[PDB]
Design a protein around this ligand. Structure first.
Ligand code: CL
Ligand code: CL
Ligand code: CL
Ligand code: CL
Ligand code: NA
Ligand code: NA
Ligand code: NA
Ligand code: NA
Ligand code: NA
Ligand code: NA
Ligand code: NA
Ligand code: NA
Lengths: 30, 30, 30, 30, 30, 30
């Protein structure tokens, strides 16, 4: 139901943030 | 239902993070 | 009520993320 | 109670994101 | 209660955004 | 249960934001 749908979107938000962290690490390296 | 409304705003937040990751990838490419 | 207020706050958060994506687009435009 | 405390922290998150947007605008300008 | 636990994680997320805003302010100072 | 899963996802999100703050600190170190 709905509480699970909410947790799923939080998952998808963490996933985007991980990709943000990697782009920044690339930038910090060059 | 407001619980569905909450999940939808979270999905929209994920969408914006997706766009942020793309722009940072572009900057890393500099 | 309160679940609505939570959703309205997530929408404001999404709005801020839009502006962040926009400035990042500007910075990418190097 | 608790649902209000949650909305309050979402407020404080949006506030930090607004300050992030302004720092990025400054960077996009110079 | 898990609702208190949720508010606490949100506060911790706000703390991290605070640190992100500081570092960006430092970069804007370049 | 489900509210716990929501909180555990917010904690993972906080963890990603820590790494973002760290890379930004590195970039600030210009
Ligand atoms: Cl990397
Ligand atoms: Cl690109
Ligand atoms: Cl500005
Ligand atoms: Cl500083
Ligand atoms: Na995830
Ligand atoms: Na990468
Ligand atoms: Na990439
Ligand atoms: Na935008
Ligand atoms: Na606010
Ligand atoms: Na400013
Ligand atoms: Na400032
Ligand atoms: Na950190």
């Amino acid at each position: 139901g709905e509480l699970k749908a909410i947790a799923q979107e939080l998952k998808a938000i963490a996933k985007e943030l991980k990709a943000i962290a990697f782009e920044l690490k690339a930038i910090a390296q060059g």
